[PDB]
């Protein structure tokens, strides 16, 4: 580890180029990670906040369930005991001052809302605080919700469904706004289902309830594959650079081998140098990443935590160490007779 560290000192140039490459890849991965978690919470935060155990859908032609096409009839709700119907629709909201499209979720009157959302389902519509400010509306003002006049029951926090904030209404109001005889679009089950489901019904886990949302699976899947290529590219870049680079050092390694340096010593030296270089690159990438992400998290959906910056950071660095050992394997094969030449 002695020679390895001072090689880095005396040739900071060569390593700056390669560490920058590792830093960019980590920067992209850290920011791509933040963006995929942000988009995922943009699609699921409301359902996930409600935290159901299973979710009962309705299908047509025995196809996979879709939140865009499922409805639960009143009888269907009485069938599943100890469970409430959740209606999910997206429609236009119009105030005297402004308008926009938003998601509307409807639950039976009095059902307590998740602490993420707080409050409890009241008669009328509970608007997200940011949405009420946009519309210059205050609690108690009339608003046009899906072509029907509804009273603003109060303000709430924002959860999301299909890139839209959720307006929470009582099951009766949701029926008027979505123009349906159904009591909801799905059935939320918090306990494990003890009844076996019907031909048109289908039970799903919380995760599977997300894949029934139209945009979610098809866009998270594409983002995850991109992340996989990025992690793979990082490993290959390190291996490619480090194989060529360790070959550059054969002469100095041969001199140490001739002097008596053990194989363990040479392998530790080489891997130590790579570990420092990869650490530098990954730290700078994730540093710049969290900063740029925090700087952008207002214009683009971006989830920024410790696990979402350091998880990928540590993953990339460990891939680099595995890659590095692959590239450094040949430091123990250097014949010491290369030093007598």
């Amino acid at each position: 580890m002695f020679l390895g560290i001072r090689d880095i000192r005396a040739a900071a140039g060569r390593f700056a180029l390669i560490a920058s490459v590792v830093g960019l890849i980590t920067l992209l991965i850290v920011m791509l990670t933040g963006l995929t978690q942000g988009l995922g919470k943009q699609n699921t935060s409301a359902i996930e906040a409600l935290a159901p155990h299973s979710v009962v859908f309705t299908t047509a032609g025995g196809s996979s369930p879709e939140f865009t096409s499922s409805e639960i009839s009143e009888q269907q709700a009485e069938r599943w005991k100890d469970s409430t119907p959740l209606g999910v629709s997206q429609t236009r909201i119009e105030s005297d001052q402004n308008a926009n499209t938003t998601a509307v979720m409807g639950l039976p009157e009095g059902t307590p809302l998740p602490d993420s959302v707080g409050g409890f389902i009241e008669q009328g519509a509970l608007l997200p605080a940011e949405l009420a400010d946009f519309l210059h509306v205050r609690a108690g003002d009339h608003i046009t919700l899906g072509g029907a006049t509804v009273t603003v029951a109060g303000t709430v926090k924002t959860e999301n469904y299909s890139h839209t904030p959720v307006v929470w209404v009582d099951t009766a109001t949701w029926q008027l706004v979505s123009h349906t005889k159904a009591v909801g679009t799905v059935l939320l089950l918090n306990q494990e289902p003890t009844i076996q489901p019907q031909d048109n019904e289908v039970v799903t886990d919380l995760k599977g309830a997300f894949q029934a949302m139209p945009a979610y699976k098809s866009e998270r899947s594409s983002l995850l594959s991109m992340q996989a290529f990025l992690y793979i590219i990082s490993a290959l870049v390190t291996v490619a650079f480090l194989t060529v680079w360790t070959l550059q050092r054969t002469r100095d390694i041969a001199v140490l081998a001739a002097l008596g340096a053990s194989k363990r010593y040479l392998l530790i030296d080489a891997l130590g140098q790579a570990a420092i270089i990869l650490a530098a690159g990954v730290a700078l990438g994730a540093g710049i990443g969290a900063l740029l992400g925090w700087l952008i998290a207002g214009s683009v959906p971006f989830s920024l935590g410790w696990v979402s910056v350091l998880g990928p950071a540590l993953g990339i660095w460990l891939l680099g160490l595995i890659g590095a050992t692959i590239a450094v394997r040949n430091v123990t094969k250097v014949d010491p007779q290369i030093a007598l030449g």
Binding site: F2, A257, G260, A339, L340
Partner: protein, 216 residues
Amino acid sequence: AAPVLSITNASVVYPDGISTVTALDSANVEIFPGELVAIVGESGSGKSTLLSIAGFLQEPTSGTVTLHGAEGLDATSTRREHIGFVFQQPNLLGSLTAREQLLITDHLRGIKPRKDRADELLARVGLKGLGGRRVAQLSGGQRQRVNIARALMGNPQLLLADEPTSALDARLSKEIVELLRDVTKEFALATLMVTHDRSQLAYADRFVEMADGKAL
């Protein structure tokens, strides 16, 4: 009263391209503490091959080599604890300073580097105070001198010099041999010195002449 190195009936056979070639042929050499032994001969007579055998840089294809006091140790562990090398090229590691080129041997041996020892040994080679120079601030002779000092850092009992006067003029090459013999005497070293400048035998206690891989 006890030899340091003994090479008994040793031979080396490298695969020279498609065929094989006998480099060393039945070499017999024994050095005692405080001896300067030269090995003379033309280029390609087997000098270097015998040196590399004496440094455990390759086992003989037949015959045995015994370094007493390092019995029961693999070839690499033998070089690290008992043998100092004065390569034909100074082999100074680029990114290290004059003093650091002694210290790294302490580190590869697993002991806290001894700065004072390095400065004393550099001074013992007439580079006193030059511990901080980098390789670019060292003349031809000076690097060879740093090379010798490094060979002395682990305090070996076998000192192997591989034509260490090959890139130095008449004056400088005298100094390196005088230094080599003087150190050989002061620290009771057993030294092999390969050389082609027969003008340097006068400073060796004895010499071997070599031709076609057979010593005479």
